[PDB]
């Protein structure tokens, strides 16, 4: 009974013994785990056996402990540790000796080293791994298979396991990598492994790159690696080069850049796609970073402080060479090009956008001549490049200089929409949409508006490749037209705008193009539905009958979607059905906000009935359940107090959503809806307040929920107190104690993400206190006899806000909320709080800083705080 015989069944088409033996060896893997591991290692370590059998055994060893899922990987690691130490030594020596001996290029033994070491290194086991691997690489008598196997395992180590445990060992492994990178190595396969290993190990060697002699040697080997006869080493070396640009930019000044500048330009000019891709990516990453540092430089300059780190303007200096190449490589597309495919032409087009943003004015002189010459050239490749280059230049430069160019080139744009080539039509639709978003002045004018709409509506019936793209142009045009009209009559809605003449026509076209049988391609249906939403949202007064007609159609489609729920036969059908439902609810939300109160009443019954049916039929993902939540929320906001008729039916579903520890986003939506519910149905939530209070407290009791849920729980507590009024005394002490416990929380200052979470938690705590005090303040001018209930806790209130004022990490929101509190207790109690703020006079910095902030919220609230404070400063 030899394991090789059953191992051949894995590669054979017959699989009856495949799963049978696999399950038997898995039962061994839980009971006779050292036995199964030892016998498998023996087979792997026997060169006499067929090498395919050894590969199959190595696959079994790897799959016995590896796992893509981090949780499954963690428990598998614990399973590996749950074995006799001597038993694991029986196979550790086998693995470390089997590698390299096999005459295979995949070298399956390298996988086995990766899995075992990724678990033993954290527990400081197998201390001879690193010295052994280094010795194997550095031994001058090692064979090609020896070195190829070892470097493969090293790269597998760096990629798989976390970087924390290898920080102290980085200097040792680095000397091994660069030893296999020098040109003196005869084979190229070993060099390929060396480049790949360094790619996944660049993060460990932060200290090594700090060293000067190490850095100079490090870039020397990679620079000489790019100029290699083989292409695989060439491309792999380039990915290493772009990574160093993205992280260690500061050290590139010292002759580092003048060396890369020659290699990268040649790499882009190469006809081979892969090397061209890396050359483009390198010159895009430098621009991407250059934008971020430019923001930091301006922020420091406006703050009066010298910048933390500066740039040398590499992109600006070298733009005159990138632009001619980038324009040229655009003329390399093919008519049979996949939409979802990364190509040098697409990368070049994207890269041009960041070029414009980095240098606003210096780009146009180097690109304007190109688009002018090839705008009517008979070959459609060059016509496509010229129009595509036009769209990129829109973002960067100041629009004032662009106005003469765009208005002059408008007549040539419209005729391009009727070009016999679909590719040029697609780019024409994209660039006219961009010209509307960025330069609406040239798009909204009497001469060119009417022809623009004629071509735009004509394009809605074209092929989906361009039909989807032109649809997004309509949404941009509607927003520009809506903003163009400025009624300025305090109504806040213009009576008439430029799109009023043909509003009903374009709405009709958008309705029918949605129902196209081929809307799946290029997300045509998804695009078409959204432009309908933006059209309705951006409608004028005259279009009121039109938006009424659309509401009837949308409601009709909702009832139809109910029937499609009953019959379903495939997972892809489920995805399409769920996406359609989400879009339909999204459109219904927009039309409800626009429609008048009277029409909202008659259709409310059907809207609620359909919405609750979606929630009840929770046969799909959480998207359908979540979408119905805020759809009801916007209905409640527009309905007002009339929603009380639906409380008895909405109550069971509200509790179900509130009591759901899974799908934290869905629970988040329900929490937000409660705040709206108490605001609109004020002073009437009393019969339903006790249940939602208990349900909320239960969710706050446990800990395994998402952290983002917690702050909103505190915010709704304050809003409920404001809504109900003086009836909160039943739960007043419970919420106060819970708020007090949550307020006194401290997290490490180094983690910015924790800092933001704690700051948002502080904002919710402060806002809850304002609602608590306002709940007992009362509408009457005098304080209510319930305001002394919170009197004992005022000292803790002022101590808390003093703690907030002490931290420099205060954002622009906490200061406004704290200032609102100070005024509130000032007007709630009066004389007593004067001594309390006297004992803590440092609060005055918050009062003064509340006006220096640019946010109007802090300025107004702090102005109120200082006004009422001065009344008690000199009252006698």
């Amino acid at each position: 009974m030899e394991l090789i015989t059953i191992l051949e069944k894995t590669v054979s088409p017959d699989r009856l013994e495949l799963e049978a033996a696999q399950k038997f060896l898995e039962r061994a893997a839980v009971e006779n785990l050292p036995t199964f591991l030892v016998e498998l290692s023996r087979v792997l370590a026997n060169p006499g056996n067929s090498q395919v059998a050894r590969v199959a055994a190595g696959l079994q060893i790897k799959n016995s402990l590896t796992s893509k899922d981090p949780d499954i990987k963690a428990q598998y690691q614990q399973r590996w540790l749950a074995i006799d130490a001597n038993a694991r030594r029986e196979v550790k020596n086998y693995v470390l000796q089997t590698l390299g001996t096999e005459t295979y290029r995949p070298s399956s033994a390298s996988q086995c080293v990766a899995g075992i070491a990724c678990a033993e290194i954290p527990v400081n086991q197998w201390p001879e791994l690193i010295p052994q691997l280094v010795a194997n690489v550095t031994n001058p008598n090692s064979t090609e298979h020896m070195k190829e196997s070892t470097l493969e395992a090293i790269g597998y180590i760096c990629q798989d396991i976390d970087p924390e445990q290898l920080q102290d060992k980085s200097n040792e492994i680095l000397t091994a990598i660069i030893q296999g990178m020098r040109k003196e190595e005869p084979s190229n396969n070993v060099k390929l492994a060396a480049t790949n290993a360094l790619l996944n190990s660049l993060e460990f060697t932060k200290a090594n790159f700090d060293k000067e002699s190490e850095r100079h040697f490090i870039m020397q080997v990679v620079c000489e690696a790019t100029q290699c006869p083989d292409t695989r080493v060439r491309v792999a070396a380039l990915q290493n080069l772009v990574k160093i640009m993205s992280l260690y930019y500061q050290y590139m000044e010292t002759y580092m850049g003048p060396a890369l500048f020659a290699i990268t330009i040649e790499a882009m000019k190469s006809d081979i796609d892969e090397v061209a891709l890396q050359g483009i990516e390198f010159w895009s990453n430098v621009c991407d970073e250059e934008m971020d540092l430019a923001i930091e430089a301006s922020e420091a300059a406006e703050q009066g402080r010298p910048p933390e780190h500066t740039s040398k303007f590499y992109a600006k200096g070298a733009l005159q060479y990138l632009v001619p190449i980038l324009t040229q490589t655009l003329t390399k597309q093919d008519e049979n090009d996949d939409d979802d495919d990364w190509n040098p032409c697409k990368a070049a087009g994207v890269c041009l956008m960041l070029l414009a943003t980095c240098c606003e004015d210096d780009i146009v002189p180097h690109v304007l001549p190109f688009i002018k010459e090839h705008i009517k050239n008979p070959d459609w490749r060059y016509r496509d490049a010229a129009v595509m280059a036009f769209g990129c230049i829109l973002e960067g430069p100041e629009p004032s200089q662009l106005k003469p160019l765009v208005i002059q080139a408008m007549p040539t744009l419209i005729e391009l929409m009727k070009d016999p080539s679909v590719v040029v039509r697609d780019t024409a639709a994209w660039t006219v949409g961009r010209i509307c978003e960025l330069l609406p002045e040239a798009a909204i004018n009497d001469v060119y508006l009417a022809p623009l709409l004629q071509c735009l509506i004509e394009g809605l019936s074209a092929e989906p490749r361009v039909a989807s793209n032109v649809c997004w142009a309509f949404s941009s045009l509607a927003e520009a037209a809506y903003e163009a009209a400025d009624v300025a009559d305090d109504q806040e809605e213009p009576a008439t705008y430029c799109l009023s003449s043909s509003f009903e026509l374009i709405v009709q076209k958008l309705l029918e193009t949605t129902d196209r049988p081929d809307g799946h391609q290029n997300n045509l249906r998804s695009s078409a539905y959204e432009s309908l939403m933006e059209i309705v949202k951006n409608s004028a007064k005259d279009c009121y009958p039109a938006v009424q007609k659309t509401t009837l159609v949308i409601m009709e489609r909702l009832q139809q979607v109910l029937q499609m729920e009953s019959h379903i036969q495939s997972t892809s059908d489920r995805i399409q059905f769920n996406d359609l439902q989400s879009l339909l609810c999204a459109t219904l939300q927009n039309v409800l906000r626009k429609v008048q109160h009277q029409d909202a009443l008659q259709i409310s019954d059907v809207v609620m009935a359909s919405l609750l049916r979606m929630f009840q039929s929770t046969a799909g993902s959480g998207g359908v359940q979540e979408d119905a939540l805020m759809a009801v929320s916007t209905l409640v906001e527009v309905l007002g107090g009339e929603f009380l008729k639906y409380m008895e039916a909405f109550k069971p579903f509200l509790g179900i959503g509130l009591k759901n520890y899974a799908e934290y986003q869905v629970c988040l939506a329900a929490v937000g809806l409660v705040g709206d519910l108490c605001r609109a149905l004020q002073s009437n939530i009393i019969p339903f307040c006790d249940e939602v209070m208990q349900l909320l407290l239960e969710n706050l009791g446990n800990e395994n929920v998402h952290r983002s849920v917690k702050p909103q729980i505190l915010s709704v507590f304050g809003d409920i107190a404001l809504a109900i009024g003086g009836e909160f005394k039943k739960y007043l002490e419970v919420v106060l104690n819970t708020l007090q416990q949550a307020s006194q929380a401290q997290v490490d200052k180094s983690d910015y993400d924790m800092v933001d979470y704690l700051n948002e938690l502080r904002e919710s705590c402060l806002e809850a206190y304002t609602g608590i005090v306002q709940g007992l303040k009362g509408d009457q001018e005098n304080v209510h006899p319930d305001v002394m209930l919170v009197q004992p806790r005022v000292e803790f209130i002022l101590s808390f806000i003093d703690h907030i004022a002490g931290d420099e990490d205060h954002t622009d929101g906490v200061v406004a909320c704290a200032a609102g509190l100070i005024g509130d207790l000032c007007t709630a109690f009066g004389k007593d709080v004067l001594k309390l703020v006297e004992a803590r006079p440092m609060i005055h910095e918050l009062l003064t800083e509340g006006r220096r902030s640019k946010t109007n919220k802090a300025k107004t609230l702090a102005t109120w705080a200082t006004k009422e404070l001065r009344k008690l400063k000199n009252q006698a």
Partner: protein
């Protein structure tokens, strides 16, 4: 890849557009609370 979502509005899709809608609703609700508290502040 990691850059295809920038070329010619290809990034715009169901998941991305839902995110923009959610932030719109949150901003509208937050703004509505602000003036309602402002008028009750009696200032």
């Amino acid at each position: 890849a990691a850059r295809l979502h920038r070329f010619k509005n290809k990034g715009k899709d169901s998941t991305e557009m839902r995110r923009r809608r959610i932030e719109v609703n949150v901003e509208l609700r937050k703004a509505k609370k602000d003036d309602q508290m402002l008028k009750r502040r009696n200032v």
